[PDB]
Design a protein around this nucleic acid. Structure first.
Lengths: 93, 78, 57, 136, 116
RNA sequence: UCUGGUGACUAUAGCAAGGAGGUCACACCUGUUCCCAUGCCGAACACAGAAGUUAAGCUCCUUAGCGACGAUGGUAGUCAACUUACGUUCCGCUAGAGUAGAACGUUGCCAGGC
RNA sequence: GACUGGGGCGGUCGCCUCCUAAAAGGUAACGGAGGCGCUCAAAGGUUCCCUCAGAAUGGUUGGAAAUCAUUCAUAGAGUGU
RNA sequence: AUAUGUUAAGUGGAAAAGGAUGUGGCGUUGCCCAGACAACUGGAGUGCG
RNA sequence: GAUUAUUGGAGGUAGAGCACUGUUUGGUCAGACAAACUCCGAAUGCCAAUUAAU
């Protein structure tokens, strides 16, 4: 399937990121062809319901301001003591 | 039991004596060092025991030249 | 001018740099005040001891 | 008995034990692991005792990789002595863990066999561990 | 071979820690080839060349073997150089031994008004 | 621009595999009559020079495999503050090392002949 | 004679370099680990040229480290102590 | 005093490895209408004497 | 004399990483450790300009 994200606008402090992951959402970034470094939020409960339909290497359609720019999943960032996801890197193909 | 240890040399005050940008005079000592950590540049003379000093009186600069090498220069007009 | 400052917490128990900074602004005792116009230097001295004084417009 | 052959110095300072693990957080060879969640030294006698306990319940039907090794020696002076006048000889060798570091790994055995096989080794280790499977 | 020119720049770099003088003690380059000899007066003040001789022009290099040129190519600078307004030169070896064609050019240069 | 000298910015210039070129020059190459040369040797450094060739060097071009360079985003630490004794927590500055994208087969100075 | 986790007994006392020393200098303990009380008439001054360890292949096999040549090397030898 | 939820031990008002169908919140799974789990009537297979 | 703001520069701690010196588990590849290891390297502090504000 596909994700459905928003844009994480401005730039905010480490407490506001720490108040963000209790609601479940995981921050991310998108780069590649013509995208020019947009920042999003990815909901972790919904992000794993995508991986078990396309794999750990598939193709998704990430909507960054209603632009399904068809990214791949490049890099995880994990914490083994708390079992969550911390930061995700998408690249636009 | 006993200890075979202790027994140290005291100190030699070994660093930068002047700082980047100030008017140094004609014979001021600009660095004390073992070996050449920082090379002599232009209008600067490396002394015996490698303690580089100034020759003409002016401002100082610490400037880089190589991959991992540095030099100290002194320029005239202030 | 602007930026009326007021000293509320005292300097009894604070380091040697958090007493010199308060003496720079012209604050003598508790509930003292000054009126100094905004700067990059003045408004940088305020967050040096912003847990001591109260700044108000 | 795990100890290095030669060390460049026999009397070292004590290692630091606050924070979080540097590296070695993930299972990388096997399929099931045992990561600690509290910080302590482990002193190489309590790894001889937690290795053999895993070996017997497996019936030697899999492989065991221990992923720590005591590098740092620790000293002690004999009983009823006064303070100072030296520093004592080497008693044994410690290894520091921090919460996150995988200790043991298994492979080549079922899950419901290995889960009751790592419990017989956490009761011989001081730290509170839990049962972590491989990254998927 | 063993890179006859790439070894000279190794030898030239250790000559020229001292000799790079400027604006009243300029260098006087030397170079060689199988056929010719080249020379120019320079000083390192972010690039100044004062006079440049050669041995490939329509003035010399129509004559015999290599040295009666290299004694009379010293006076090709030494005519021009002092008439440009230079004096009190410094000379480099350029990486070569002070011998043969290089020894000829240096002695011939100060005999006709390029003082050292 | 296009060749050569000569210093600078100094692997974003390097290292390695391929491919093209040569009276304008640089080289390769033949020689010991002499100044000069080997602690063994014209190999080298000198020195004489009709001839012989682009083969290697240098020079130009392209392929990013190796080295170097390297964001944004997040984490580790941490100056200040507030509770706290817990292998601590929460808030406000600054900001790494590694890793992804990428830049990348050099940009220029001055005299001399085309 | 003094220091001395009371005194004695043992130990140590001056100079040099590193670490603890908290990214300027400075900084203690009977804390950790080593040297010194000299030597060179060339191992000093200057001038001109050369670049090392080991690895690998080959042959009187002196294991290719006696000596002998080729490649590869980026500083892995050497610098009186 | 006020608006909201938690605790049943005097916890608050002394401390650990381990044990524990105490209880409240946030997610995820597999069976369930052929009505499911529990009790209830007649295959070398799980402890027994 | 002090204090911040802007600016320049010296230096190898915390952290991290094995390129070197030693340590080390499983088949040149994957992983780990370091007061006397460093290809790298903060936050602060320190010395300055003779620049402005208190």
């Amino acid at each position: 399937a596909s994700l459905k994200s928003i844009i994480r606008q401005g730039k905010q402090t480490r407490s506001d990121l720490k108040q963000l992951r209790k609601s479940g959402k995981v921050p991310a970034v998108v780069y590649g062809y013509g995208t020019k470094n947009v920042s999003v939020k990815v909901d972790e409960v919904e992000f794993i319901k995508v991986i078990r339909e396309v794999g750990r290497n598939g193709v998704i359609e990430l909507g960054v301001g209603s632009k399904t720019i068809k990214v791949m999943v490049a890099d995880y960032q994990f914490d083994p003591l708390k079992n969550q996801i911390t930061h995700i890197d998408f690249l636009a193909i | 039991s006993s200890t075979k240890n202790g027994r140290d040399s005291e100190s030699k005050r070994l660093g930068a004596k002047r700082a980047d940008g100030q008017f140094v005079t004609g014979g001021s000592i600009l660095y004390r060092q073992r070996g050449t950590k920082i090379y002599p540049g232009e209008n600067v003379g490396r002394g015996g025991d490698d303690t580089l000093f100034a020759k003409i009186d002016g401002v100082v600069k610490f400037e880089r030249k190589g991959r991992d090498k540095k030099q100290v220069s002194v320029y005239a007009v202030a | 001018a602007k930026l009326q400052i007021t000293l509320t917490r005292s300097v009894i128990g604070r380091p040697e740099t958090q007493r010199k900074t308060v003496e720079a602004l012209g604050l003598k005792k508790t509930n003292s005040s000054v009126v100094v116009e905004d700067n990059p230097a003045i408004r940088g001295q305020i967050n040096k001891v912003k847990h001591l004084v109260t700044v108000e417009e | 008995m795990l100890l290095p052959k030669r060390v460049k110095y026999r009397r070292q300072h004590r290692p630091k034990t606050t924070g979080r693990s540097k590296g070695g957080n993930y299972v990388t060879f096997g399929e099931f692991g045992l990561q600690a969640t509290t910080t302590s030294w482990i002193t190489s006698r309590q790894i001889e005792s937690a290795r053999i306990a895993m070996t017997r319940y497996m019936k030697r039907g899999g492989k065991v990789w221990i992923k720590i090794f005591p590098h740092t020696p620790y000293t002690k002076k004999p009983l009823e002595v006064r303070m100072g006048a030296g520093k004592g000889a080497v008693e044994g060798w410690i290894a520091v863990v921090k919460p996150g570091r995988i200790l043991f790994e298994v492979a080549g055995v079922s899950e419901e066999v290995a889960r009751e096989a790592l419990r017989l080794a956490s009761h011989k280790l001081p730290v509170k561990t839990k049962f972590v499977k491989r990254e998927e | 071979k063993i890179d006859k020119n790439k070894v000279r720049l190794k030898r030239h770099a250790r000559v020229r820690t001292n000799l790079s003088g400027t604006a009243e003690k300029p260098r006087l380059n030397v170079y060689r080839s199988n056929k010719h000899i080249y020379a120019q007066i320079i000083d390192d003040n972010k690039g100044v060349t004062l006079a440049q001789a050669s041995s490939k022009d329509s003035d010399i290099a129509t004559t015999a073997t290599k040295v009666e040129l290299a004694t009379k190519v010293g006076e090709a600078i030494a005519k021009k150089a002092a008439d440009k307004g230079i004096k009190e030169i410094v000379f480099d070896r350029g990486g070569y031994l002070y011998h043969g064609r290089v020894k000829a050019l240096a002695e011939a240069a100060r005999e006709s008004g390029l003082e050292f």
